[PDB]
Structure 1
Amino acid sequence: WKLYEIKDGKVIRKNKFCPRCGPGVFMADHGDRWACGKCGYTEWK
Structure 2
Amino acid sequence: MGQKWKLYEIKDGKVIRKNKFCPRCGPGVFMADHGDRWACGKCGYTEWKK
Q: Could you state the TM-score of these two structures normalised by the residue count of structure 2?
A: 0.44
| Distance in 1 of aligned mates of 2:10 and 2:17 | 8
Determine the structure 1 residue equivalent to 2:10.
6
CA-atom RMSD in angstroms: 3.1
Question: 1:34 and 1:8, CA in 2 relative to 1: closer, same or farther beyond 3 A?
Answer: farther
% of aligned pairs identical? 100
Residues 16 and 34, structure 1, Cα contact 8 Å, conserved in 2: no
Whose radius of gyration is greater, 1 or 2? 2
Structure 1 spans left out of the alignment, 5+ residues: none
Question: 1:42 and 1:11, CA in 2 relative to 1: closer, same or farther beyond 3 A?
Answer: farther
Q: Could you state the TM-score of these two structures normalised by the residue count of structure 1?
A: 0.46
Offset of 1:39 from its aligned partner?
A: 7.5
Residues 39 and 45, structure 2, Cα contact 8 Å, conserved in 1: yes
